[PDB]
Amino acid sequence: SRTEDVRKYVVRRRVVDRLKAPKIQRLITPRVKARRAKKAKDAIAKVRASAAERREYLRLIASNRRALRQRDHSKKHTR
Amino acid sequence: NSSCVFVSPIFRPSTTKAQVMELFAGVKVQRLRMYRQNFAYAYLDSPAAAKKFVEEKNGTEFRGHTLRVALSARSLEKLRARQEAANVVIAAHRHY
Amino acid sequence: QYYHAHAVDATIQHEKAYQRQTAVNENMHRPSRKHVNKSGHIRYSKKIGLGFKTPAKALNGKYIDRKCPFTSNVVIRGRILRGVVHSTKMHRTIIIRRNYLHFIKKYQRYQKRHKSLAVHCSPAFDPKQGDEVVIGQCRPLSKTIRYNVLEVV
């Protein structure tokens, strides 16, 4: 029943003295949990940054258009 | 500093001019103007009250909508001079 | 109410399949005015590069051509050659002759040589035997056709 140490129960075999214990696969230690959680973090952060470059670039396009529009409105103001 | 206050989100079809006078009631209003963006310009007689008005109306709810009020740099005297400047050049245009 | 659909064209529809351009829809009650000619019809007519003028019969014509460089997806690239119309006995296709002189180095003299090319000719041009045409290289249009007519002189 879960929430226990699994390394105390697996089968060891003696040869003729050393005991042969298999490597425990799919054992997600907290070190393994660290990178998996880190994996889902940089992904959402890296798409958050991409929206900033899109946002700032749209500022570059619109700020120039705003400048040109009032420039045409200042020239017609004198007219 | 400036007496003018910018008020939103007052919608013209949703709220009548009398009801938008109701939250302005209690503080003297020089003039009220209504706009499509659902933002309204209401000139205030007392510049001191305008500084009090934003504090009084900060976080308030009007007609079921959370209301945002800010003081506006535009003044009545600069517009009325522009207004008179409009009529004189208007009359010239009609003569053309 | 009910829209007055455009009548069928007897002089163009003779191929037992409906002839239409695969770039525009001509069955709209309201067009887009982007692809519309001066007669009120919906027509696709691009412009090819290298400073070639789209003929008026291509802009305001009734013909349908899937291999015409102006009113289809056939693009001109590669080589732009020049020749004389040799034969117009096929349908939408002409044979041109590229007459040239070949220099024989040993004898220090030239000799007259000619080359034949099968070229697709759009209904916008209608050339005649002995005329002069400018052709542009396109994709293989048939077993022998790799050029499209661009001018008629």
Added chain:
Amino acid sequence: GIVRSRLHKRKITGGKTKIHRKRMKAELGRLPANTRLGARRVSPVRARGGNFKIRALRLDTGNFAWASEAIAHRVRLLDVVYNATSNELVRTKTLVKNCIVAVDAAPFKRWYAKHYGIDLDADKYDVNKASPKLQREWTRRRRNHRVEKAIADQLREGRVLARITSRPGQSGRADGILLEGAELQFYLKRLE
């Protein structure tokens, strides 16, 4: 096997090409689909580059689009009525590109009522159930749009003519559009 090279063809001069090379896999050909009307049966084909081609064997449904309304619906294929290649393709009910088919007109009738409030026949959509705000939207759309009688009569009957715009033996699906305008009037004469 099947090849698409020009080595077997005669030269334009009429001469015979002397082939000095064995057949190549880069010039192969495959056997055609001969897609027919029926329950959906397809066969994947491992094309060049690892991509898969869906050789459809039988098909019964596909997305058919009303071009004048920018609308498309999934409908079942009822019949194939015209083929510009031969009558044998109509007689065998072979689905190929540009072949004229008859599809179920029910979704286009349901959409037209939901959009314009004009039930052509007048689960099923009811125009009068719509809230009174919606009729204002319908009136704005009704002045913008005017439908053709030839198409509308097809909705009333329940079957509407269409033209397949996809390649069933290449993509594995039979999509199309409804015949509108002079194209429809062209095919009505042949079918009559």
Added chain:
Amino acid sequence: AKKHLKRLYAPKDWMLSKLTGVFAPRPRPGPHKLRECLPLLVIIRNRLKYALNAREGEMILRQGLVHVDNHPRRDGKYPAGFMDVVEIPKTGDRFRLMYDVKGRFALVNLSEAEAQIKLMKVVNLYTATGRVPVAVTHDGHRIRYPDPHTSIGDTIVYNVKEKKCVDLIKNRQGKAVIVTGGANRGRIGEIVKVECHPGAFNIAHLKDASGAEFATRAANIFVIGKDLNNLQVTVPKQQGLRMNVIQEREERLIAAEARK
């Protein structure tokens, strides 16, 4: 595909003798064309002479010592072409690859913080997914958000450390350009006028500082400064001037005599 590259079929700029090797390092795909690149084994062994053999060349490269554009490379067949900053921190070489007046590759040594300054020529302008303007350069890099005024044929100076563009130089007449193709390649000159023939190649007429009028196809020029006087980065030692061969012969004979 083919994996071998014969000694004779190898580019002549690599300077490998036809008697020593039967084969040559075939440049694996990457940033530069195999006709326009020095494999990092060729660079580390035949040019810098840090490696004695090719076996001692893989020793250096696999260790990650050789950095290209602020990035370590381990494959000896890495292209490592033109206008790239190569750094070996153990020896602090910090040099970039350029073309001398004779058209060959040059290890132009760079100063500190000059490695960050790097240029690259825009070869294609297209939109990626989501309406994103993208510019791909001669190095193969893709710029996700370039300057709104950037066009094809202009070069952007690009910070390798920051991974960000810092300025743009538009391709116009009266700019400093360095030729990258042919026998004319490796010459810094000034664009006097460019003749535009649609479809075919574009002809770029240039005039270097000494006043020589030379031309080439517009696909070979590379803008290197706003004017001939001031250049963004350092260039090979000849300053991009090809002097007369007869005077080339006379001076080296005089200099050889001056030794004795």
Added chain:
RNA sequence: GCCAAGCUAAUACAUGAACCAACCGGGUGUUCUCCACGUGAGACGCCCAGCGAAUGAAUGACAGUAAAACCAAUGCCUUGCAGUAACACCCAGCAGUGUUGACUCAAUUCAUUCCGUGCGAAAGCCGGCUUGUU
């Protein structure tokens, strides 16, 4: 060259990650608050709105004219038109602007669709220090 039975793994095969986590539009509701008595406005419920692929519709530019009335609607000043980007808000310029010599191309929005013939953060491995449910 070969079968049958017992285990046992993987980055072999399959399945699958809700919250943390946005902007964005289309179809709607016999839904609630209002204005005069409908191009009316606002909230909320549900149906879709990922990359790619299939079909259809719109974009993917103009560049051979100068002034007034008239009517309906909508902006404004004040209670008739001078000024003026576009927009009925939470974004008062978060695109009116891809490219080529030329594109039925790139890319975007809208409608239907993907049935093995697609898509995980391999649900993976290893290292360092301060040895850390970031």
